[PDB]
């Protein structure tokens, strides 16, 4: 197995789309035009009516383009998800991920973001959405919440790696970062 | 009395009477789920009971439509 | 992708006007949807990553490399089946218009594919019951898609009643387990595998055995497959078995942890009876679909022996057997749909009545296929020889791999009985071949202008007009050569089945 | 005296002697009513009311189908039975009503101890909805999917067009 | 049957007063306090009057809808039931299911999700 | 890890703690086999059905019969009708045998 | 072309008018239902311009102080 | 080599009630929708949870 | 919540008949090794009326008793008997002080709660008098934690929800203090 | 009448949400909408198919009178 660095065991929907490579957009376009193109190919392989070629009606090409558009995004979404999971090469995504987290930590802001959900719902949302991309071909389900169950330890952002000295981020301790679990239960142990 | 299949005499001699037996048999499963969930003070069993009731009602409708169309097929001349 | 594209197709089908062409083009959109579903699923699911077993959706589902292979097989076979409704099977409108007259045909298939793929993944008793209903309901709706057909509706009534009784048995088994343990998640229930009543899981298997047509519950499936249209019988006789047998394998994988030999004996009793009925049942029959129904019952008994043994050799046997049997099933029904074009026409004793749903209904309607189309007749012979288990066809290695797993586990009786069952069932497999070819010389110089194919016109009398459409011909050619020439790549294919793991690891 | 035993005794008698399809649609209602009442008085009043809300709507639809399919067959037909064989059958059945054979579980009474820790005190339906709409939301969304399939399924079966 | 049908008319009239007109709540809080201040709360006569007052508010609202049952009978002609099915399934159901989505959205937007108290 | 054994008020019920300690034992990496978690499994099942505890009560009742002990002299006093949970039975200073009100709280 | 059926992607405004005149039971039921999610999308505006969200209810049991037990507490002894 | 390779792959190690694979990664009950602190019968400390049994990936 | 359970009185005697319920007593006292403590004798309405003064007086002992329960790790009811006795005595001390210092003001408030379905919103006027009397004589202030001091519901000037029926005694006692204290 | 049963179950499925609207918060509200949006496709389907009409057995069609002149 050619495993790589784990970035996010449950990447948020916005992060997955933002981290699209130019090829991911290219495949999104290929899916969008691959569905009308296959309708032309199937007619070319064997005409639907009779024995002569007939272009499929525009209404069929309209619904085909929509089906391909969703299919192209689902393919691109799974292509970008593998980089977060470490299944696919993600050297570029690690550098971008480290810059964004260190930038947010230096601002004493949560790398995950503030959530409308209470501690139970953040945990419940992560349980529902983590690894859901494995069935994205069957039915959709996305991480659209700011939970903290991402399968990573934020202490690994406190070691400077090669090519990160020019960032000059001064990182505070984790108990001063707003909206994190380790800085939330101050007065009561069952209330954030 | 159960092992000699006494329940086969209690089921009526129409296709709809078989439908009623199926509903009663499934309703026995839900009553057993409610009984266990209440004793344990477990809401997961009651969620299961609610799912069984909704699903059992779905197949009741699907089976009825098949029987409805089956009767239409017999009354097909419809010269009127 | 499946769920999202199904909603668009549901709405789009109800918007545009009703015409045969539009329904056929909507079916081709369903073909593209399954292809994209396969591409997306392949892009994200890989055998090496799923070997451990990954939980999804609050542990309601659990996908591993054993589940994943079956999901891809289901998608691939569903692709081949949709080509039947998305392209011309015969090219003559009196026969082919049936596949385009129901706009909800493709919608029901997409509904059932979702149920087929999710069922092997179930990791909770609540979701096990929900999904097994989702798969069953779609099968009933597909069995009744032709609601103007008396036999099609009668089959759906029989299917609904029997399949509801099995579902209640399945529900009753899960309720008993929940009553014992108060738990719903399968992995949680595995922690108490030594304390719950293991026969509560045999009741769960009994409901699953009804849904695959195992003896003694074989009667309804033999009746339903013969009464349903050939296009419907092709789907419903194969698709439920791909998912339910995979689920039975996973359940039997958990059952073997406690090693209850009493449970192993009851299942062996059902396998033994099904071999006897599957082989002797088909000896005196005149319908081809009734014959294939017993063939299905027999091949399920072979797979259940591998499922019952449930070892490392059983994963390879079941995985290879289910793949090669699905292709043989697809190939045979493709030929049966095509060869209706060679049927003689009247211009009479026994008052034989043939309908548009099943133009090929009797075994002796395959007469003189060796004369009408030698290449197709050979393709049908290769498939039938594969079911017989003639080496080096795919069907031989299927029986060979099943025997290895069965004999490795001490199932001496069932291994001997199946080999006797194979010999008995060879009698009615050979009868197909006898009908195809044995009267070739005593009929070679005869004038047959009374065929269904002769009703078709001719374009210019200077062109070459192929007698069979392009897509259906290429599929039959591809599958037949795969069945014939599997010896070339058998070593590489079986090495792949070595990697498919179900919590083996080390 | 547990009068539910008598109710089920009468219901079992009428299920053996039922002849036509109207009597069967009455055996169903004569079964849900003992279930609803016993759930109301012993285990769950919430599910006693859910049964009434859902099954009654199913019963009337079931009844209206009987009107469209009643086919004269069993009004004039004859049954034999015998009063002695009916009552003897019901007597033998009544002898064994122990669905479980754990004598201690069936004879020894138990209690629970209340605690005051649950100060946020709400109904069972609020907790059921809390879990169903958060943790088992997939189960709810599949059920919604199955209900959609039934809508399409009923139309493609019944509608001639 | 006649008794039960008119019992249902009273029930649905009283439910219209409960679901939309506050049930037994007084029309005027000022007048309700004025009338009840004449009677000592340490005497049983206060609770008789309060029981008459509160039920009177419910009676007045329910009387108006029992009047409305009679009022619509004397003004409108009968509608065929096959038209009633189309009216309920094509008009009333889409509107009611719109409000079942409308109402929670409004309350969430203004942080006013209801609780029992 | 999905929630199991949820009480009627949304929190853990009586037997959740037994179930939680079983999961922690079975999933701990310090255990070579599942033998250490066998007593925890019996405790969880005892929390739900109390089958062994009911069995102990069966022995005590039976053993008291064979020695002639009176059930009403060694057991615990009880009342079967809720209306007769009277102040005299409850032991109040000015108690009475008149029925208590249970019609409307 | 006085009363033709508008094409939605060519004449979106006229397409809306056709359904609002001929199928009011469809046009206005959707219009009411659209106001649900639209208000849910206006929630961030309220959190910045009218008033903030309330403090969550103490519905997670008794609030246990996040500290160690006071070992010098006395009073009301046996 | 071919005989040796098949002997390794086709060997099925024994499973009993003492050793088998359970796919549960974390202990449940850290959070409940309401009333997380019930009868204080939850004795599992999520602050000092011991390492879990990580599943084995044979291809890693 | 009216769910039938096995830990308290159920809805009706038909529930008891189906369950064959036995209402069981135990004549044995607590073992003599455990120190004795007098139980709290107040009923529902007085306890709810005194809830926020028991909280403001026994906060250290209430938290210490609950923190003992968490540290008990299942052995709760046994290991926190000593802490529980402190809680009972402290709560009885508050009720004792109410009956000697604020007796009329206290009895006024929980007689309104009995008159008004035990809803705090229905008895603000009597509560205000009791809060004023307790603060002067016991130095206890009702505080609802987690919110600003000026957003406490019991201090709201113009509440949206008000009692339909007015407690006559509370109206009279509120007027008397208005004309005599806030001149 | 048959389609009444699927819609009746859908209405009965909202009962858990009615008494738990506050607790589930925005997460439950979005799930509630998703429950209703999937069922609204059934409503679109029934409208477009005209499945909720009355199944008459007679149909009144206006024949055109034409003359095959010579
Ligand atoms: C957007 C407009 C649109 O859907 O297309 C117009 C489409 C065609 O209307 P038309 O005037 O009859 O067109 C004449 C031809 O039959 C129409 O022939 P056609 O082939 O041109 O239209 C078929 C259409 C296929 O249309 C669909 O598949 C509908 C997708 C919804 C699911 O194929 C497309 O054009 C695809 C692009 C348009 C749909 C894009 C939907 C994106 C997903 C959201 O109208 C609809 O389909 C309306 C369905 C939705 C009704 C509203 C549902 C409300 C749900 C939320 C309520 C709460 C708020
Ligand atoms: C067989 C049946 C099977 C079932 C099929 C049914 C399918 C169900 C699956 C659908 C999803 C399942 C989950 C449903 C439960 C959702 C409940 C929930 O999450 O509430 C919490 C969530 C709030 O909790 P939170 O922790 O504070 O998270 C805040 C943001 O949502 C998160 O932070 P953010 O970074 O995303 O910031 C938000 C802002 C970010 O905008 C910015 O300020 C720029 C930042 C970069 C964004 C640029 C890339 C944007 C991509 C274009 O704008 C957004 O990105 C909107 C998020 C939604 C994106 C589109 C959703 C994809 C649906 C397909 O409520 C939401 O607003 C979720 C988003 C809207 C709901 C999506 C509904 C989809 C249908
Ligand atoms: C946005 C949804 C609406 C966009 C529709 C625009 C469109 O489809 O192009 C119009 C074109 C119709 O052209 P045509 O019908 O041949 O000429 C009129 C004949 N009387 O239609 C066509 O010829 C088909 C050309 C491709 C249409 C692509 C539309 C994709 C729909 C959006 C998918 C993403 C969401
Ligand atoms: C369209 C055919 C595409 C074949 C794709 C087969 C496939 O699913 O991949 C092989 C699969 C292992 O895939 P995996 O390693 O998990 O993921 C990454 C692999 N790229 O291994 C598998 O599990 C596949 C299991 C099913 C194999 C079925 C074999 C089908 C034989 C060809 C079909 C006949 C083609 C007829 C042509 C008609 C079209 C004109
Ligand atoms: C308000 C009270 C309403 C009921 C009062 C009438 C009492 C009659 C029995 C009520 C239900 C008891 C169990 C019966 C189940 C249905 C079996 C049946 O067929 O109905 C019995 C009725 C008697 O007909 P009979 O002449 O005795 O037998 C046929 C002889 N060839 O044959 C009939 O077809 C007549 C049935 C009339 C319609 C009854 C509809 C069912 C109502 C049930 C509501 C109560 C639920 C059940 C409670 C009792 C449970 C045993
Ligand atoms: C899709 C749009 C979602 C983005 C949006 O418009 O609202 C998001 C917004 C979250 O942002 P914010 O106000 O900063 O939350 C504070 C966190 N402590 O506030 C919200 O989360 C409001 C909820 C958004 C739901 C919009 C309607 C969902 C659409 C259903 C179809
Ligand atoms: C923004 C707000 C307004 C949007 C209006 C859009 C109308 C689209 C339309 O009507 O789409 C047009 C189509 C097809 O039209 P047709 O009547 O079949 O034939 C067209 C006219 N001819 C005969 C001249 C060709 O209708 C539909 O698919 C109707 C689906 C509506 C389902 C609504 C169900 C109720 C849900 C309410 C919320 C709970």
CA distance C350 to C344: 16
CA distance C406 to C418: 11
CA distance C253 to C201: 12
Closest CA to E36 of E46, E28, E26: E46
Distances (CA, A) of C28 to A40, A44, C22: 11, 13, 10
Distance (Å) from the alpha carbon of I64 to chain H's nearest alpha carbon: 14
How many degrees, rounded to 5, is the angle at CA B15 between CA B13 and CA B16? 100
Return phi, psi of residue D19, to 5°.
-115, -55
Q: Which helix (H) or strand (E) holds C208?
A: helix C199-211
Return phi, psi of residue D51, to 5°.
-60, -45
Q: What is the DSSP letter of F9?
A: T
Q: Is B43 exposed, middle or buried (CB count within 10 Å of its CB: 0-12, 13-18, 19+)? A: buried
Other Cβ atoms less than 10 A from the Cβ of D97: the count is 8
Q: Which residues does chain I break after (C to N > 2.5 Å)?
A: none
Return phi, psi of residue A188, to 5°.
-115, 145
Using a 6 Å cutoff on CB, does residue A127 contact ligand 2? no
Using a 6 Å cutoff on CB, does residue A61 contact ligand 3? yes
Q: Which helix (H) or strand (E) holds B65?
A: helix B43-74
Question: Taking phi first (over 0 means left), then psi (-120 to 50 degrees means alpha), and beta for anything else, what does residue H5 get?
Answer: alpha
**Positive or negative: CA dihedral B15, B17, B23, B29:** negative
Lookup: tokens for H52: 């879990």
Structural contact between residues A8 and A141, judged by C-beta atoms closer than 8 angstroms: no
Closest CA to D35 of A146, B49, F36: B49
Residue A121 near chain D (CB below 8 Å): yes
Resolution of this model in Å is 2.9
Helix I81-101 to helix I103-115 angle (10° resolution) is: 100
Structural contact between residues J52 and J2, judged by C-beta atoms closer than 8 angstroms: no
Return phi, psi of residue C379, to 5°.
-60, -40
Residue-wise DSSP of C403-452: HHHHHHTT-HHHHHHHHHHHHHHHHHHHHHHHHHHTTSGGGSS-----BS
Return phi, psi of residue G73, to 5°.
-75, 130
Rounded to the nearest angstrom, the gap between the alpha carbon of residue C149 and the centroid of all alpha carbons in its chain is 23
Establish how many alpha carbons lie within 13 A of residue E21's alpha carbon, considering only the half-sphere containing its beta carbon. 19
Helices of type H across H1-60: 2-10
Lookup: tokens for I109: 């408030």
- Kindly list the protein residues whose Cβ atom lies closer than 6 A to any atom of ligand 4: C 42, 46-47, 69, 72-73, 76, 323, 474-475, 478-479
Lookup: tokens for A6: 């784990």
Return phi, psi of residue F28, to 5°.
-75, 140
The alpha carbon of H23 and the centre of ligand 2 are apart by a number of angstroms equal to: 29
CA distance G24 to G18: 10
Distances (CA, A) of C119 to A139, C60, C127, C184, D139: 14, 11, 9, 16, 14
Return phi, psi of residue I162, to 5°.
-135, 155
CA distance C42 to C73: 11
CB contact under 8 A, B63 and C130: no
- Cis peptide bond N-terminal to A47, omega within 30: no
Structural contact between residues D121 and I1, judged by C-beta atoms closer than 8 angstroms: yes
Lookup: tokens for C360: 């090929």
Using a 6 Å cutoff on CB, does residue J34 contact ligand 2? yes
Q: What is the DSSP letter of A179?
A: T
CA distance I150 to I132: 17
Structural contact between residues E111 and A116, judged by C-beta atoms closer than 8 angstroms: no
Rounded to the nearest angstrom, the gap between the alpha carbon of residue A71 and the centroid of all alpha carbons in its chain is 16
Lookup: tokens for J47: 């409208």
Q: What is the per-residue burial (b if ≥16 Cβ within 10 Å, else e) of I109-118?
A: bbbbbbbbee
3-class SS of residue F79: strand
Name the β-bridge partners of F28. H52
Residue found by looking up tokens 């006007």 in the block:
C17
Q: Which helix (H) or strand (E) holds A97?
A: helix A91-106
Atom 16, ligand 7: residue with shortest CA distance: J48
Lookup: tokens for I49: 């009326």
Q: Beta strands I23-24 and C61-63: pairing type?
A: unpaired
Q: What is the DSSP letter of F28?
A: B
The atom number, within ligand 7, closest to the CA of J43 reads: 34
**Whole-angstrom distance between the N-terminal and C-terminal Cα of chain C?**
36
3-class SS of residue G65: strand
Among I68, I145, I146, whose Cβ lies nearest the Cβ of G69?
I68
Lookup: tokens for F87: 């102040």
Residue found by looking up tokens 């359904």 in the block:
G19
CA distance B66 to B72: 10
CA distance D94 to D107: 19
Structural contact between residues I112 and I165, judged by C-beta atoms closer than 8 angstroms: no
How many degrees, rounded to 5, is the angle at CA A11 between CA A7 and CA A15? 100
Structural contact between residues C334 and C380, judged by C-beta atoms closer than 8 angstroms: no
Other Cβ atoms less than 10 A from the Cβ of I31: the count is 6
3-class SS of residue C152: helix
Structural contact between residues B41 and F7, judged by C-beta atoms closer than 8 angstroms: yes
CB contact under 8 A, F7 and H38: yes
Residue-wise DSSP of C258-282: T--HHHHHHHHHHHHHHHHHHHHHT
Structural contact between residues C484 and C384, judged by C-beta atoms closer than 8 angstroms: no
How many degrees, rounded to 5, is the angle at CA C136 between CA C131 and CA C139? 135
Lookup: tokens for E94: 């889409």
Contacts of A118 in chain J (CB under 8 A): 25
Distances (CA, A) of C245 to C210, C241, H37: 12, 6, 44
Beta carbons within 8 Å of C408's beta carbon, 6+ residues apart: C309, C311, C313, H10
**Whole-angstrom distance between the N-terminal and C-terminal Cα of chain J?**
56
**Positive or negative: CA dihedral C81, C87, C92, C98:** positive
Lookup: tokens for H34: 């309401």
Beta carbons within 8 Å of D155's beta carbon, 6+ residues apart: C104, J3, J45, J46, J49, J51
| SS3 per residue for chain I | CCCCCCCCCCCCHHHHHHHCCCEECCCCCCCCCCCCCCCCCCCHHHHHHCHHHHHHHCHHHHHHHHHHHHHHCCCHHHHCHHHHHHHHHHHHHHHHHHHHHCHHHHHHHHHHHHHCCCCHHHHHHHHHHHHHHHHHHHCCCCCCCCCCHHHCHHHCCCCCCCCCCCCHHHHHHHHHHHHHCCC
Q: Which helix (H) or strand (E) holds D29?
A: helix D21-38
Name the β-bridge partners of C62. C55
Distances (CA, A) of C189 to C71, C177, C202, F101, I65: 25, 9, 15, 47, 37
Lookup: tokens for I30: 């607590």
Q: What is the DSSP letter of C120?
A: G
Name the residue of chain B whose CA is nearest to J59's CA.
B80
CA distance G24 to B78: 36
Name the residue of chain E whose CA is nearest to I115's CA.
E41
Closest CA to C89 of C375, C338, C373, C342: C338
Rounded to the nearest angstrom, the gap between the alpha carbon of residue C151 and the centroid of all alpha carbons in its chain is 21
Alpha-carbon torsion, ordered A91, A96, A101, A107, to 10 deg? 150
Among D110, D112, D127, whose Cβ lies nearest the Cβ of F6?
D127
Q: What is the DSSP letter of F78?
A: E
Beta carbons within 8 Å of E46's beta carbon, 6+ residues apart: E36, E39, E40
Lookup: tokens for A127: 């349980």
CA distance E65 to A183: 59
Distances (CA, A) of D116 to A43, D156, H32, I11, I52: 72, 55, 17, 20, 17
Q: Considering only the C-alpha atoms of chain H, give the largest distance between any 2 of them, rounded to a whole number of Å.
A: 62
The method of structure determination was: cryo-EM
The alpha carbon of D6 and the centre of ligand 5 are apart by a number of angstroms equal to: 14
Partners of chain H (3+ Cβ pairs below 8 A) = A, C, D, F, G, I
Lookup: tokens for C111: 């509904």
Residue-wise DSSP of C36-79: HHHHHHHHH--TTGGGS-EEETTTTEEE-HHHHHHHHHHHHHHH
Lookup: tokens for I115: 């008159």
How many degrees, rounded to 5, is the angle at CA D64 between CA D61 and CA D70? 135
CA distance A131 to C66: 18
Lookup: tokens for D91: 């007597």
- Cis peptide bond N-terminal to D158, omega within 30: no
Q: Beta strands C54-56 and C61-63: pairing type?
A: antiparallel
Establish how many alpha carbons lie within 13 A of residue C34's alpha carbon, considering only the half-sphere containing its beta carbon. 28
Closest CA to C136 of C212, C67, C61: C212
Contacts of A141 in chain D (CB under 8 A): 138
Other Cβ atoms less than 10 A from the Cβ of C210: the count is 22
Structural contact between residues D32 and D69, judged by C-beta atoms closer than 8 angstroms: no
The alpha carbon of J30 and the centre of ligand 6 are apart by a number of angstroms equal to: 11
**Positive or negative: CA dihedral D151, D154, D157, D158:** negative
3-class SS of residue G62: coil
Q: Please count the residues of chain A.
A: 192
Helix G24-41 to helix G12-22 angle (10° resolution) is: 120
CA distance I28 to I46: 29
CA distance J14 to A3: 45
- Cis peptide bond N-terminal to A53, omega within 30: no
CA distance C364 to C381: 15
Residue found by looking up tokens 């609002």 in the block:
G20
Structural contact between residues A150 and A112, judged by C-beta atoms closer than 8 angstroms: yes
Q: What is the DSSP letter of A186?
A: S
**Positive or negative: CA dihedral C292, C295, C300, C303:** negative
Establish how many alpha carbons lie within 13 A of residue B62's alpha carbon, considering only the half-sphere containing its beta carbon. 34
Distance (Å) from the alpha carbon of G78 to chain A's nearest alpha carbon: 30
Name the β-bridge partners of C362. C287
Lookup: tokens for C422: 């194979």
CA distance I180 to I11: 49
């Amino acid at each position: 197995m050619e495993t790589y660095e784990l970035i996010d065991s449950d990447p948020k929907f916005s992060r997955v789309v933002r981290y699209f490579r130019p090829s991911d957009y290219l495949t999104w376009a290929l899916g969008t035009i691959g569905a009308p193109g296959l309708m032309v190919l199937f007619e070319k392989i064997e005409p639907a009516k009779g024995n002569t070629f007939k272009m499929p009606p525009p209404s069929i090409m309209r619904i085909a383009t929509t089906i391909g558009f969703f299919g192209g995004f689902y393919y691109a979404y799974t292509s970008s998800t593998k980089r977060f999971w470490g299944y696919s090469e993600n050297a570029k995504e690690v550098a971008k991920d480290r810059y964004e987290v260190k930038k947010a930590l230096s601002e004493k802001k949560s790398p995950y973001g503030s959530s409308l959900l209470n501690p139970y719902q953040q945990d419940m949302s992560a349980r529902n959405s983590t690894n859901s991309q494995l069935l994205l071909a069957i039915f959709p389900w996305f991480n659209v919440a700011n939970h903290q169950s991402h399968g990573i330890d934020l202490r690994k952002y406190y070691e400077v790696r090669d090519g990160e000295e020019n960032w000059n981020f001064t990182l505070p301790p984790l108990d001063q970062v707003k909206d994190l679990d380790v800085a939330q239960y101050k007065e009561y142990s069952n209330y954030p | 009395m159960d092992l000699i299949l006494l329940m086969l005499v209690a089921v009526g001699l129409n296709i709809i009477d078989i439908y009623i037996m199926i509903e009663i048999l499934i309703m026995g499963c839900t009553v057993n789920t409610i009984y266990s969930a209440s004793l344990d003070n477990d809401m997961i069993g009651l969620i299961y009971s609610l799912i069984q009731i909704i699903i059992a009602g779905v197949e009741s409708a699907i089976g009825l439509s098949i029987l409805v169309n089956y009767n239409r097929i017999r009354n097909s001349e419809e010269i009127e | 992708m499946l769920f999202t594209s199904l909603l668009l197709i549901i709405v789009y089908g109800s918007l545009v006007n009703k015409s045969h062409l539009l329904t056929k083009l909507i079916n081709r959109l369903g073909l593209i949807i399954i292809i994209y579903t396969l591409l997306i699923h392949l892009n994200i699911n890989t055998l090496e990553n799923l070997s451990i077993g990954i939980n999804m959706f609050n542990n309601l589902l659990l996908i591993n490399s054993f589940n994943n292979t079956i999901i891809e097989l289901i998608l691939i076979i569903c692709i081949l089946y949709v080509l039947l409704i998305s392209f011309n099977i015969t090219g003559l409108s009196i026969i082919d218009n049936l596949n385009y007259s129901k706009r909800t045909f493709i919608v029901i298939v997409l509904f059932n594919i979702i149920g087929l793929t999710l069922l092997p993944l179930v990791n909770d008793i609540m979701i096990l019951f929900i999904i097994i209903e989702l798969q069953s309901y779609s099968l009933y709706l597909l069995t009744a898609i032709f609601n103007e057909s008396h036999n099609s509706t009668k089959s759906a009534l029989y299917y609904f009643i029997v399949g509801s009784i099995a579902s209640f048995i399945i529900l009753d088994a899960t309720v008993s387990i929940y009553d014992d343990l108060g738990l719903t998640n399968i992995q949680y229930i595995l922690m108490y595998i030594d304390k719950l009543e293991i026969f509560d899981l045999l009741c769960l298997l009994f409901g699953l055995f009804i849904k695959i047509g195992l003896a003694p519950f074989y009667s309804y499936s033999i009746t339903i497959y013969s009464l349903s249209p050939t296009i419907i019988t092709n789907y419903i006789s194969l698709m439920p078995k791909l998912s339910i047998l995979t689920l039975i394998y996973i359940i039997m994988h958990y059952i073997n942890i406690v090693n209850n030999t009493d449970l192993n004996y009851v299942i062996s009793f059902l396998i033994l009876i099904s071999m006897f009925i599957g082989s002797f049942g088909g000896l005196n029959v005149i319908r081809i679909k009734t014959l294939l129904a017993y063939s299905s019952l027999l091949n399920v008994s072979y797979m259940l022996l591998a499922i019952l043994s449930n070892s490392n050799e059983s994963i390879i046997a079941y995985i290879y057997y289910i793949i090669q049997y699905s292709l043989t099933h697809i190939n045979i029904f493709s030929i049966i749909l095509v060869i209706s074009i060679y049927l003689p026409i009247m211009n009479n004793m026994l008052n034989v009545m043939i309908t548009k749903y099943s133009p090929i209904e009797y075994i002796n309607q395959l007469k003189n296929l060796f004369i009408n189309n030698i290449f197709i007749a050979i393709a049908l012979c290769i498939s039938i020889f594969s079911l017989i288990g003639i080496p080096p066809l795919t069907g031989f290695y299927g029986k060979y791999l099943v025997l290895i797993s069965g004999l490795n586990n001490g199932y001496v009786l069932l291994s001997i009985v199946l080999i006797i069952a194979s010999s008995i069932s060879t009698v009615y497999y050979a009868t197909i071949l006898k009908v195809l070819s044995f009267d070739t010389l005593s009929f070679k110089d005869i004038i047959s202008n009374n065929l269904i194919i002769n009703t078709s016109p001719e374009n210019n009398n200077n062109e070459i007009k192929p007698e069979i459409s392009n897509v259906i011909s290429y599929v039959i050619s591809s599958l037949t050569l795969i069945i014939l020439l599997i010896i070339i790549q058998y070593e590489n294919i079986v090495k792949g089945a070595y990697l498919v793991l179900l919590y083996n690891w080390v | 005296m547990n009068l539910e035993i008598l109710d089920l005794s009468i219901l079992g008698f009428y299920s053996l002697i039922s002849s036509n399809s109207f009597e069967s649609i009455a055996i169903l209602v004569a079964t849900i009513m003992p279930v609803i009442t016993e759930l109301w008085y012993n285990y769950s009043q919430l599910f006693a009311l859910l049964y009434t809300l859902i099954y009654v709507g199913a019963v009337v639809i079931l009844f209206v189908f009987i009107l469209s399919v009643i086919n004269e067959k069993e009004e004039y037909e004859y049954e034999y039975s015998g009063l002695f064989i009916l009552i003897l059958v019901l007597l033998l059945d009544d002898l064994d009503d122990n669905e479980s054979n754990d004598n201690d579980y069936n004879n020894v009474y138990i209690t629970d101890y209340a605690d005051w820790f649950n100060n946020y005190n709400e109904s069972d339906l609020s907790v059921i909805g809390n879990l169903l709409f958060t943790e088992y939301a997939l189960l709810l969304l599949i059920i919604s999917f199955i209900l959609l399939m039934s809508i399409i399924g009923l139309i493609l079966i019944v509608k001639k067009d | 049957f006649f008794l039960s049908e008119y019992c249902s008319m009273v029930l649905m009239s009283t439910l219209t007063a409960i679901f939309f007109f506050g049930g037994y709540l007084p029309f005027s809080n000022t007048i309700h306090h004025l009338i009840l201040n004449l009677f000592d709360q340490h005497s049983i006569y206060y609770f008789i009057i309060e029981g008459i007052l509160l039920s009177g508010y419910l009676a007045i609202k329910a009387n108006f809808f029992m009047f409305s049952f009679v009022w619509i009978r004397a003004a409108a002609p009968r509608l065929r039931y096959d038209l009633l099915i189309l009216f309920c399934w094509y008009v009333l159901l889409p509107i009611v299911f719109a409000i079942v989505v409308f109402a929670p959205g409004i309350l969430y937007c203004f942080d006013a999700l209801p609780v029992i108290i | 890890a999905p929630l199991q054994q949820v009480g009627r008020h949304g929190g853990p019920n009586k037997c959740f703690g037994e179930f939680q300690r079983v999961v922690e034992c079975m999933t701990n990496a310090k255990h070579d086999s599942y033998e250490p978690c066998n007593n925890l499994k019996n405790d969880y099942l005892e929390c739900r059905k109390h089958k062994v505890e009911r069995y102990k009560a069966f022995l005590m009742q039976k053993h008291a019969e064979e020695l002639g002990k009176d059930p009403e002299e060694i057991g615990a006093p009880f009342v079967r009708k809720r209306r007769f949970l009277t102040s005299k039975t409850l032991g109040l200073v000015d108690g009475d045998d008149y029925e208590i009100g249970v019609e409307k709280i | 072309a006085i009363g033709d059926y508008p094409v939605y992607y060519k004449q979106p405004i006229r397409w809306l008018s056709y359904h609002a005149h001929t199928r009011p039971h469809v046009f206005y039921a959707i219009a009411v239902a659209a106001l649900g999610p639209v208000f849910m999308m206006a929630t961030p505006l309220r959190r910045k311009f009218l008033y903030d969200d309330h403090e969550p209810l103490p519905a997670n049991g008794y609030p246990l102080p996040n500290r160690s037990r006071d070992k010098t507490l006395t009073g009301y002894d046996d | 080599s071919t005989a040796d390779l098949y002997g390794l792959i086709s060997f099925t190690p024994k499973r009993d009630i003492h050793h088998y694979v359970i796919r549960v990664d974390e202990v449940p009950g850290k959070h409940f929708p309401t009333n997380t602190t019930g009868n204080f019968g939850n004795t599992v400390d999520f602050e000092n949870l011991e390492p879990r049994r990580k599943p084995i990936n044979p291809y890693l | 919540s009216s769910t039938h359970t096995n830990d308290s009185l159920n809805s009706s005697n038909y529930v008891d008949k189906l369950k064959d319920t036995h209402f069981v007593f135990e004549n044995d006292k607590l073992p003599s090794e455990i120190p004795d403590v007098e139980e709290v004798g107040a009923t529902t309405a007085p306890l709810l009326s005194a809830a926020y003064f028991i909280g403001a007086k026994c906060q250290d002992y209430n938290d210490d008793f609950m923190l003992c329960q968490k540290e008990a790790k299942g052995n709760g009811p046994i290991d926190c008997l000593k802490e529980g006795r402190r809680v009972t005595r402290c709560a009885s001390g508050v009720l004792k002080d109410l009956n000697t210092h604020c007796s009329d003001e206290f009895r006024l408030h929980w007689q309104c709660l009995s008159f008004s379905n035990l809803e705090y919103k229905n008895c603000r006027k009597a509560e205000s008098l009791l809060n004023k009397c307790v603060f002067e004589k016991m130095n206890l202030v009702k505080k609802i934690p987690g919110i600003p001091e000026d957003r406490q519901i019991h201090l709201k000037q113009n509440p949206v929800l008000k009692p339909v029926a007015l407690h006559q005694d509370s109206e009279v006692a509120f007027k008397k203090a208005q004309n005599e204290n806030s001149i | 009448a048959l389609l009444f049963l699927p819609f009746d179950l859908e209405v009965s499925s909202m009962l858990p949400y009615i008494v738990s609207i506050y607790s589930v918060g925005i997460y439950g509200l979005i799930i509630f909408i998703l429950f209703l949006l999937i069922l609204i496709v059934g409503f679109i389907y029934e409208f477009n198919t005209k499945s909720l009409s009355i199944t008459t057995i007679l149909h009144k069609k206006n024949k055109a009178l034409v003359k095959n002149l010579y």
